[PDB]
Write a protein that binds this DNA or RNA. Structure first.
Lengths: 135, 106, 189, 197, 171
RNA sequence: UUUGCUCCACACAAUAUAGAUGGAUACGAAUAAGGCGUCCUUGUGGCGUCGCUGAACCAUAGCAGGCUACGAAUUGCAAUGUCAUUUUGCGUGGGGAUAAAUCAUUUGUAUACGACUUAGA
RNA sequence: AGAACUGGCGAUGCGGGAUGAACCGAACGUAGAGUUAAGGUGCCGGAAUACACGCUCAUCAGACACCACAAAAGGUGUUAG
RNA sequence: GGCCAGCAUCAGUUUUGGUGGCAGGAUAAAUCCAUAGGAAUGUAGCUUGCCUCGGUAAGUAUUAUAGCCUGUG
């Protein structure tokens, strides 16, 4: 029989160990790990490496991240501190193009007028070689 | 090099009003680029000009300017309130004013 | 309430392939090919195996959960219609007037027609669908067989032949005349 | 920020698009709303057809040519929706509705211009998945529009030219990106990358 | 509201016939100390011959959560007044704290039965100690081993009014 | 009677803006799905990668922007400090084209009156 | 139709209830600034296409009390008990 | 010698941010650490048709090559 090509969607899905990125509140922009699922609408997060407290948060304030790591259901803050640095989540995340495009946003937002002038000069120098190469 | 501007363009939305009563002494300005009352707090006290045309060339030119300033922040979405020397003439509802940076704190 | 994950499963027999992408399913097998478009119900299909296919609805809350079994049964019917085929036998019941039924070739489709249905002069036609083969029976001479792959097309073509031979303005308890279905089954068995 | 805003009105909700248009066009923005025959509207098709046949009843009794004029085009149904949200009986509302142009399909001025999307009016983001909705082209054809086939014959003729423009532009960007990587290693790029760029 | 849990001790005013009366204790979910005292006298007048003027309140203490970062199944026994009579009910909630389970009790009792705050008495809030006595399906479906589920439709928030590409809902 | 008219080039003078002062920057379709790149037993294919906002991309330095391949000060501590686009007329030179309609008379396929429909160098 | 107490209209503008003598807020010299009431914040229309938990899809849904009509009796429609 | 503006230092009324110190409560409750006990949405290990270094199978086993809960300090 020929391979039945049945493929729909590889969702990032909320489970115990799923890393999330908080987008609202006091700790917006920080990584945390889902500890256990309270209901369909809210989970319990704890990210102890970045300084997030152990919270019960909705799934509206967080954004799911494609990387996960194995930790037991209903762990504590010390156990999540252990398993986070074991799986090296802050190093798997910083290699991704998501975190690079976030750091690029925060880098461009903190440029002075001199550091934008330098960008103008260097970009002119780059396009002078690129448009000569493509022609 | 092609640009020269030192202002932020905004629109004259409406007079300060209730429903069915308007107060022509205070205008509402939508500064383009502003979204919240915090970071609408940056533009408080800055000058606004409304530049328009006429036909009587008075004092050497045909364009004229109504000056005013930003006074406070309006509700929740980066609209601000402004007061002018002579008030804006209500045909400019939806017309470009220019918010300068003349009293600066940077 | 709302559920968490409702799941059904569809077994695919040997020689059959089921190509699903963006909720258009295509079943290919021994009798031929069938194609269904399930693009109105939000539901996921996973190739868990070459032998069976998982179907699942997340949340849903008793409406998706009832449409899921309908999706599973439609995919199973369009699998059975290609592994096995579909076959509907119909019988003529007439008290007095012989229902002369022929299969004519008009300008378009192969229409079939009835004549002398309770002595009418109106020649009642049925346009047939493009997946159904119509034959007559050898031993009994009051039977007509409609066979194909799509059970919906075959059953509707069998129903359209009893929706035209309907007695009007009489007593339907008294007048039991018309074409009626007798056997619903498969052609390979 | 653009002078004229071209809105690709496919898969937008009617009264959620019309509110944003009637606020922007009163603030002073020139808006053209292109491809109006693919507008969505919530509620099932027979519900919206019964609402339009309820609208068809309301005409002036003593002389019907004075009454509410029931326009049947999709662009004019969206225009009725926007005109109910603009104060169209004053000079300000009359001048605000002159900044608006609504078309079915995409006319040749706006064939070669960038189209935008209003996300707070999209059917995908706003309706629950599983709800029934109505397409304005099918509703207009059911209530008596005549040119559904014409704007569908003139649409794929445009889509052929657009999809054969996009292949040339895609090959141009692949020829740009195959040679722009030759400069991304050098000192100018390693100095630009520290600035975010 | 932003509910808190209060511990209100109260007492009848001492007389000569008894210069050491009984102390009565209530646990009251309420928004502040003022309406907590109001609810204390309201519930004590249903049980004993004592009014506000015929009594005093000995202490109010806010009870914090013992372990506010532990997911708990809470059985809530609760009576309420509908538009025809009074009914008792028993609901199971799955929250981390008592003042967060009482809030989503008061939400769904006002959503599903149209019962306002003035119609609802909370008889008992008790933690179900083990995963065998939880008997409602909407909590029992969350106590499965290795639970995981996706969120199929992601609606990204729109910061500005015009977008220049058709948004994808993928997660 | 090239005193009339039209089109062009710029030399100017008048009036009005529902409101220009870096760029309206182009696939289509789906959203319980897609975009891009590569390979290929070209398929409802395999693998990689991306989204998580356009907070992008492109242009962007030069007396309102010069000369060469030195200048800008004294618009005096701010006073839009004027640069855009339709209408219109005049002047110069440089081409180009040579008409009908209405009234009056008449017809009656029309008609209260106008209007309609006919005819007449 | 006839009474009892209070408040009001008559004699009274103003903000709200689209509009209304009586309802809600609040009673008035002429202006400026600030803050609010009753009511609201998609657009007309000044102000969150806010946030949080649920319910409902109606082939005449439903949406600010007075208030501008609604019952008895049914529906394994859906949800909770 | 005045009228129209701009800035500074003030005065009255007000509006909107940044930041410091102190006090209270179960002298916050938590987290964290130490100790004792416990169980399962049962972790190693041990039985267990083939067999994925005991994984699918389903028992045993309360920390073991993960952890959790409760009490006490």
């Amino acid at each position: 029989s020929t391979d039945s090509i049945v493929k729909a969607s590889n969702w990032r899905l909320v489970e115990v160990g799923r890393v999330v990125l908080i987008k609202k509140g006091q700790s917006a922009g920080k990584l945390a790990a889902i500890v256990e699922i309270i209901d369909q609408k809210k989970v319990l997060i704890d990210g102890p490496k970045a300084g997030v407290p152990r919270q019960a948060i909705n799934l509206g304030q967080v954004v799911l991240t494609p990387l996960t790591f194995a930790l037991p259901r209903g762990a504590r803050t010390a156990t999540v501190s252990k398993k986070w640095a074991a799986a090296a989540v802050c190093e798997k995340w910083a290699a991704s193009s998501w975190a690079k495009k976030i750091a690029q946003r925060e880098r461009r937002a903190a440029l002075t007028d001199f550091e934008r002038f330098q960008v103008m000069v260097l970009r002119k120098q780059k396009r002078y070689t690129v448009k000569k190469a493509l022609a | 090099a092609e640009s020269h501007r030192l202002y932020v363009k905004g629109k004259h939305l409406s007079y300060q009003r209730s429903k069915r009563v308007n107060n022509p002494n205070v205008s509402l300005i939508k500064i383009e680029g502003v979204a919240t009352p915090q970071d609408a707090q940056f533009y408080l006290g800055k000058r606004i000009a409304y530049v328009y045309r006429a036909s009587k060339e008075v004092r050497g030119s045909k364009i004229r300017v109504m000056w005013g300033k930003v006074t406070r922040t309006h509700g929740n979405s980066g609209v601000v309130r402004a007061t002018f020397r002579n008030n804006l003439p209500a045909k400019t509802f939806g017309a470009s004013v220019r918010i300068f940076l003349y009293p600066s704190n940077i | 309430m709302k559920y968490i994950q409702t799941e059904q499963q569809i077994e695919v027999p040997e020689g059959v392939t089921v190509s699903i992408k963006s909720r258009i399913v295509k079943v290919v097998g021994p009798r031929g090919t069938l194609t269904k478009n399930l693009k109105h119900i939000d539901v996921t299909f996973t190739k868990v195996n070459n032998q069976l296919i998982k179907v699942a609805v997340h949340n849903g809350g008793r409406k998706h959960v009832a449409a899921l079994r309908t999706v599973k049964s439609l995919v199973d019917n369009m699998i059975t219609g290609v592994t096995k085929g579909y076959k509907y036998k119909m019988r003529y019941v007439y008290a007095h007037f012989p229902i002369n039924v022929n299969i004519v070739e008009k300008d378009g489709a192969k229409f079939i027609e009835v004549r002398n249905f309770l002595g009418d002069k109106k020649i009642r036609n049925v346009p047939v669908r493009d997946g159904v083969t119509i034959e007559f029976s050898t031993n009994v001479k009051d039977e007509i067989v409609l066979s194909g792959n799509s059970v919906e097309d075959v059953s509707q073509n069998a129903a359209d032949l009893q929706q035209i031979c309907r007695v009007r303005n009489k007593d339907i308890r008294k007048f039991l005349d018309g074409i009626y279905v007798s056997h619903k089954g498969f052609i390979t068995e | 920020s653009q002078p004229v805003v071209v809105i690709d009105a496919k898969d937008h909700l009617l009264g959620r698009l019309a509110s944003t248009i009637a606020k922007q066009v009163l603030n002073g923005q020139k808006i053209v709303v292109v491809r109006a025959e693919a507008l969505n509207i919530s509620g099932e098709f027979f519900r919206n057809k019964l609402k339009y046949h309820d609208f068809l009843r309301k005409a002036t009794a003593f002389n019907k040519t004075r009454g509410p004029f029931h326009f049947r085009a999709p662009s004019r149904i969206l225009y009725k929706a926007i005109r109910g949200m603009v104060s169209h009986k004053t000079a300000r509302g009359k001048a605000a509705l002159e900044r608006l142009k609504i078309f079915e399909g995409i006319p040749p001025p706006y064939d070669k211009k960038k189209r935008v999307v209003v996300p707070q009016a999209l059917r995908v983001l706003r309706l629950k998945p599983g709800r029934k909705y109505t397409t304005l082209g099918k509703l207009s054809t059911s209530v008596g529009w005549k040119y559904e086939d014409v704007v569908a014959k003139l649409e794929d003729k445009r889509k052929v030219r657009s999809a054969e423009y996009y292949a040339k532009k895609r090959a141009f960007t692949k020829k740009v990106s195959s040679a722009s990587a030759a400069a991304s290693e050098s000192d100018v790029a390693k100095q630009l990358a520290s600035f975010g760029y | 509201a932003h509910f808190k849990e209060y511990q209100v001790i109260g007492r009848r005013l001492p007389t000569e016939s008894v210069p050491e009366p009984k102390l009565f204790r209530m646990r009251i979910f309420a928004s502040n100390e003022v309406i907590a005292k109001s609810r204390y006298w309201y519930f004590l007048q249903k049980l004993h011959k004592v009014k506000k003027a015929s009594g005093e309140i000995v202490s109010i203490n806010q009870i914090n959560e013992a372990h506010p970062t532990k997911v708990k199944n809470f059985g809530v026994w609760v009576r309420y007044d509908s538009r025809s009579g009074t009914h008792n009910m028993y609901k199971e909630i799955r929250d981390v704290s008592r003042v967060a389970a009482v809030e989503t009790l008061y939400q769904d009792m006002a959503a599903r039965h149209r019962a306002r705050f003035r119609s609802i008495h909370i008889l008992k809030v008790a933690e179900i100690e083990k995963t065998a006595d939880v008997k409602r399906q909407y909590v029992k479906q969350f106590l499965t081993k290795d639970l995981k589920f996706p969120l199929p439709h992601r609606v990204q928030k729109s910061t500005k009014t015009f977008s220049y590409k058709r948004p994808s809902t993928f997660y």
